[PDB]
Amino acid sequence: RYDVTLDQSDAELVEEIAWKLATQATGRPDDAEWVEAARNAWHAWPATLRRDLAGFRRDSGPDGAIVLRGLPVDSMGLPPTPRVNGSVQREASLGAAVLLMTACGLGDPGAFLPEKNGALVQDVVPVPGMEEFQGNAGSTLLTFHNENAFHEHRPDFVMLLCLRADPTGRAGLRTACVRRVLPLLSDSTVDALWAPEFRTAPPPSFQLSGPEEAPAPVLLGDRSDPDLRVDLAATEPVTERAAEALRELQAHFDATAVTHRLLPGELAIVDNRVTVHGRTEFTPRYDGTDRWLQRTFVLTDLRRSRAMRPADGYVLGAA
Ligand SMILES: NC(=O)[C@@H](O)[C@H](N)C(=O)O
Ligand SMILES: [Fe+2]
């Protein structure tokens, strides 16, 4: 129940709902009125899909991820893949519709002002000159991370909708769940990961060489079913045992990861409380045919971040 292919009937209904939202709803995706329309439209989805999503929200399973297949994307109408840094989806579209409806089903959408200018629907596309970036515009191997790990109100879910697959065949999303990793880790590493000996900075998407947060543990919550907070690029160990812990953690992420090559109309939803993600190295063409995902973050309890959301909006900033 973590790999869901829409049947023809459900696929046609969601298509209808997404078109209606994209073409008839007033305003544009970042407007509160559009998110409200998306929230109402979500409740028109077939019960089967709403039940699937509700089940995943309640229990994201041993891999902490779900992939839905057969969602609407306008492949014939799709323009060349953007090649600019900071690319975001400001205009109404089927992709924005699918993402924002689903976000309202799982919680609410949200974004962070310093990243992709706080857009609710963000492009994940390779950008010339950014090949070596540990982030959405890169094409070198992207290390495993919780999304925006530094942040107190980091995404609860990360949703990635494929508009255009990587035509080269080398790119794949990788997800690794701590539920697979924990039983395999050495006792010394587990003890290390519970200790406040790890310091984490914002990812480069926020800025370059940003200020690191205070030292804290990687593992959080329940001893048997913990959450985690780590970024193998942005998390610095404060002690020697923390360094070894990170090395062993990395090895087990690699060993336990599931690799997904997404196709158009496929939506991966990663539970960011328990699952890290990364991406394989690939060689972009930079000819408008490259990999194109759109990404929306979900906050399961938007209320918690009110102090960071002026006018009770969907964009989180300082204090
Ligand atoms: N480390 C991360 O969380 C990255 O995915 C970052 N949000 C980015 O878009 O590059
Ligand atoms: Fe990420």
From Swiss-Prot:
- Origin organism is Streptomyces coelicolor (strain ATCC BAA-471 / A3(2) / M145)
The record's free-text note on cofactor binding: Binds 1 Fe(2+) ion per subunit.
- What task does this protein carry out? Catalyzes the 3-hydroxylation of L-asparagine to (2S,3S)-3-hydroxyasparagine. The 3-hydroxylated asparagine produced is incorporated at position 9 during the biosynthesis of the non-ribosomally synthesized calcium-dependent antibiotic (CDA), a 11-residue acidic lipopeptide lactone. Is able to hydroxylate only free L-asparagine, since it hydroxylates neither a CDA analog with unmodified Asn at position 9 nor a peptidyl-carrier-protein (PCP)-bound asparagine. Is not active toward D-asparagine.
Domain of life, source organism: Bacteria
Q: In which residues is 2-oxoglutarate bound? A: R291
- Residues at which L-asparagine binds: E115, N136, E147, N148, R295
Q: Which cofactors? A: Fe(2+)
GO MF annotations, alphabetized: iron ion binding; oxidoreductase activity
* UniProt name for this protein: L-asparagine oxygenase
According to the UniProt entry, where is the signal peptide? none
UniProt catalytic activity? L-asparagine + 2-oxoglutarate + O2 = (2S,3S)-3-hydroxyasparagine + succinate + CO2
Pathway(s) per entry: Antibiotic biosynthesis; calcium-dependent antibiotic biosynthesis
Q: Which residues form a coiled coil?
A: none
Q: Which UniProt keywords apply?
A: Antibiotic biosynthesis, Iron, Metal-binding, Oxidoreductase
Looking at the keywords, is Metal-binding present? Answer: yes
- Gene coding for it: asnO
The GO biological-process annotations, alphabetized, read as: antibiotic biosynthetic process
Q: Where does Fe cation bind?
A: H145, E147, H277
